[PDB]
């Protein structure tokens, strides 16, 4: 664990930290400091990482309190899977009205990486079920899965697969826009609508390709991002990370 601290990884980078790894941060309203993985590039950009997938080592079918508090493992090398915790993500992303951007970074099973950036990304309080909001899609070759996707199953698909303004759901805390239970069916915790076009907390399928026959329910429950790959393609790695917007 590194010595420099601050309110986020950008604050840490601004204080002269140059190495990616584990740091304590203490956002404005945090009761106490907590550990994060900071990705610090050569340009002085310090990203605060709140989600990582890369090998299937952690089960992301976790309950409300587990998603709240965080699970998985932090590593100095950034080679482990984790969810930082909705409370922590809330505290970072809302502090001092600092405008954060979210970057989603995806890696396929062929060595290709793509990104999607969201401006003015915020996660609300537990009182509002950790609602996700953003101002706009700011670009990236992964495409804008949070806008929803035209799957073809029906003309309401896009409205029903968009993620802006969605509350967070777990199997034991259903806050989705479906009569059924998206989180329970797809085995994740996520900002579910009816149900999703982007789903980075989904089931880890080795090799990317899976199909309906692979799933117990018949729905796409993999690590999907529909604007980049078919719903039957599950990413090899994902990163969700935030930085003050001006660093874009």
């Amino acid at each position: 664990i590194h010595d420099i601290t601050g309110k986020d990884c950008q604050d840490i980078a601004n204080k002269g930290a140059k190495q990616s790894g584990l740091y304590f941060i203490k956002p404005l309203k945090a009761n106490q400091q907590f550990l994060v993985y900071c990705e610090i590039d050569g340009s002085g950009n310090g990203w605060t990482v709140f989600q990582k997938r890369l090998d299937g080592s952690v089960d992301f079918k976790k309950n409300w309190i587990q998603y709240k508090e965080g699970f998985g493992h932090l590593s100095p090398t950034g080679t482990t899977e984790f969810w930082l915790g909705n409370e922590k993500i809330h505290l970072i992303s809302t502090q001092s009205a600092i405008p954060y951007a979210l970057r989603v970074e995806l890696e396929d099973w062929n060595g290709r990486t793509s990104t999607a950036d969201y401006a003015m990304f915020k996660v609300g309080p537990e009182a509002d079920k950790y609602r996700l909001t953003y101002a706009y899609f700011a670009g990236g070759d992964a495409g804008d899965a949070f806008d929803g996707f035209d799957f073809g199953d029906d003309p309401s698909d896009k409205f029903f697969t968009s993620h802006n303004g969605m509350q967070f759901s777990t199997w034991d805390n259903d806050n989705d826009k479906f009569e059924g239970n998206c989180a329970e069916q797809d085995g994740s915790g996520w900002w579910m609508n009816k149900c999703h076009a982007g789903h980075l907390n989904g089931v880890y399928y080795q090799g990317g390709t899976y199909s309906k026959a692979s799933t117990p329910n018949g729905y796409d429950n993999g690590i999907i991002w529909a604007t980049w790959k078919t719903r039957w393609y599950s990413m090899k790695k994902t990163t969700m990370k935030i930085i003050p917007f001006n660093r874009l």
């Binding site: 799957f151 199953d153 029903f160 697969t161 479906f178 998206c182 149900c195 729905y219």
Partner: peptide
């Protein structure tokens, strides 16, 4: 994905 979506739902019926």
């Amino acid at each position: 994905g979506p739902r019926p």
